[PDB]
């Protein structure tokens, strides 16, 4: 493989694949913090060209953390369909980009080709894509999964109802649920991040969620986003099982930071099959986002985009119902502003769909980042055009506990009515029964939580 190019008479030398992958990234504060970013726009482009000229084989055989040192690398590499790999191993990343974007490449062609990819190759394609490349490429790669609702069907747009409270108060949780359902939010999941990671508390939160689900026969699923171990334990004790959640990272050390072993995720599948109230075949839920590996000291000299793609390689193995990047969840140290957050969200969603997972995005930012709510509204619409499977829904987008701003309930309704998108067909049916939705649009009585009383 060639590790150098000439640009405007100047030679641009690179030491390894990991460096080329890093410097080909568009500028972000996290890559500068990791010391892996390009020195200039010229070096960035030269890195993109070197990357584009490298083969799938060059990148598959050079994962950022070695096979023997990382269980996630082993997981990713051993899931490869080697026949699919052999067909594409001599393709340049330039050729792979053009193949993904081609109108002569069908959904079924990509279904087989993606099986010969590794996460590093997925990231490599994303790095040589413009914003519209990432949007259009993702759109022609739909991923459909099924719990009690079907998510990912082109022409549809789902939403996680996120009814969070500072004290896990069941009245405050219910009120946000009723408000969310009134806007048609909740077809992805009704998922609460709990304050106390406690078995008795999880059961009470779940019973509140399922108290509403059972009362109105809602086709959906509940979830409590504690550590996977306490979810498993509570469900084993008889708490209602919908989706089982875990935050994942793209390295073994990153998973050890979260207190996760691969055996726990396998156990989550088995507990779900034995206990969970899910009609379909998918019941797992993961969240991701750029910067997490670097935060854990677990990026090993690799950029955050490549590490983020490794998440999707790991997630794919467990065939989850939904995955979303939580794009601006952490802070300005990994993604500084509007520009970087938008780019990351488009990258994350593109890579998720190329990896073949049910990919959504929590369009978000923090109050210490150079951003505002107009960023969320910009990104959610761009991502919805890319066929993003789901976003979050909170009252006005204000999380009273997690201390950040996501998308409003209003925003899902806006996106759906703007782009003529429907909810999950099962959930849509229920919304019509309740008189909340007619022909994809909120009725006059919608947006009013008192309708349920």
């Amino acid at each position: 493989m060639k590790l150098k190019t000439t640009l405007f008479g100047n030679v641009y030398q690179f030491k390894d694949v990991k460096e080329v992958l890093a410097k080909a990234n568009e500028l972000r504060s996290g890559d500068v913090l990791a010391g892996v970013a390009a020195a200039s726009s010229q070096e960035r482009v030269a890195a993109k060209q070197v990357l584009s000229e490298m083969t799938v084989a060059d990148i598959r055989n050079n994962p950022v953390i070695a096979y023997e040192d990382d269980c996630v690398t082993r997981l990713i590499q051993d899931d490869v369909n080697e026949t699919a790999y052999n067909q594409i191993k001599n393709w340049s990343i330039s050729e792979l980009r053009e193949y993904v974007l081609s109108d002569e490449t069908s959904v079924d062609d990509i279904a087989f080709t993606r099986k010969g990819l590794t996460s590093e190759v997925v990231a490599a394609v994303a790095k040589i894509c413009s914003n519209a490349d990432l949007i259009y490429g993702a759109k022609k790669m739909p991923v459909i999964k099924k719990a009690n609702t079907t998510i990912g069907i082109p022409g549809t747009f789902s939403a996680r109802l996120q009814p969070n409270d500072t004290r896990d108060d069941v009245q405050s949780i219910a009120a946000q649920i009723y408000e969310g359902l009134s806007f048609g939010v909740g077809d992805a999941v009704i998922g609460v991040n709990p304050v106390t990671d406690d078995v008795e508390n999880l059961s009470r939160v779940l019973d509140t969620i399922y108290g509403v689900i059972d009362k109105f026969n809602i086709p959906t699923q509940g979830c409590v986003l504690a550590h996977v171990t306490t979810q498993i334990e509570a469900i084993r004790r008889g708490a209602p099982g919908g989706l089982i959640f875990q935050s994942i990272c793209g390295s073994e050390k990153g998973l050890k930071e979260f207190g996760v072993e691969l055996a726990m995720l396998d156990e989550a599948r088995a507990v779900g099959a034995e206990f969970n109230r899910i009609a379909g075949e998918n019941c797992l839920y993961f969240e991701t986002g750029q910067g997490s590996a670097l935060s854990a000291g677990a990026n090993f000299g690799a950029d955050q985009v490549t590490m983020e793609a490794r998440n999707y390689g790991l997630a794919r193995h467990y065939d989850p119902f939904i995955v979303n990047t939580v794009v601006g969840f952490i802070g300005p140290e990994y993604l500084y502003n509007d520009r970087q957050i938008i780019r990351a969200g488009l990258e994350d969603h593109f890579m998720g769909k190329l990896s073949g997972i049910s990919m959504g995005c929590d369009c978000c930012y923090t109050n210490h980042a150079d951003a505002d709510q107009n960023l969320n509204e910009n990104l959610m619409i761009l991502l919805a055009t890319a066929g993003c499977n789901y976003i979050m829904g909170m009252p006005l987008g204000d999380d009273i506990m997690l201390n950040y701003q996501t998308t409003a309930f209003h925003d899902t309704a806006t996106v759906r009515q703007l782009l003529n998108l429907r909810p999950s067909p099962e959930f849509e049916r229920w919304l019509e029964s309740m008189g909340i939705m007619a022909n994809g649009r909120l009725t006059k009585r919608a947006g009013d939580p008192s309708l349920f009383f």
Binding site: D165, T166, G259, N367, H368, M394, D398, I400, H410, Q417
Partner: protein, 252 residues
Amino acid sequence: ALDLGSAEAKAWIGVENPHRADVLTELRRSTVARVCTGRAGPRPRTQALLRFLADHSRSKDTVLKEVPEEWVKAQGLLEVRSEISDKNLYLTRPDMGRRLCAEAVEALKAQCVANPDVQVVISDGLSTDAITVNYEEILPPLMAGLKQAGLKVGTPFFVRYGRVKIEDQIGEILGAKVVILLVGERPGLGQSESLSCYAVYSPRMATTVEADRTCISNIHQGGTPPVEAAAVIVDLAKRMLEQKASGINMTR
């Protein structure tokens, strides 16, 4: 006329022609979340959007503000800092926020007690308001809890520009069996006085992972009351000494 920061503006119901209007008042009272604001088409109502933008401007100011050097000195605390120099650097360099500066290491060995059983550490972190509002309410009953019917207590000190992982260095230098860190969380939209507690048993720079810590979050008047939270942290500290474990390694 209306002040967008007033109580009446926060309690405002914007739902036009409600199905059951007494339920909406009961829903607005049950939560701090921006519920029952109504809509204009699929878009938020103007007043709700205005109140959102007003609370954002206040939230933006609340993040780059600093605890005065005089306030910490008045609380009888040692002020020490990380490798970080100012607020702007703190927001972009978390790695420097995780390490005490050279003069900080020397000051801790000079002025703190050696090998304590429980070490209490306070830091501004990402919110100065979190430690300002809650301090007098949380810190005194924590000390009168750990000492009274308890064991060897370290001297409390303030870390300026600190991140959670800095307690690992604090635990090694002081030889602490349990390190308690009271730190400001990143500020929310309409609320910025939310404090967190991070506790770890016998930490090490090269072995301790984040899962080895126990987190007590959302400590404020709108969350877990600081006085009530103080007795939780004491009990946690006692359980951590008894089990010789913290975080995911603990029982139940």
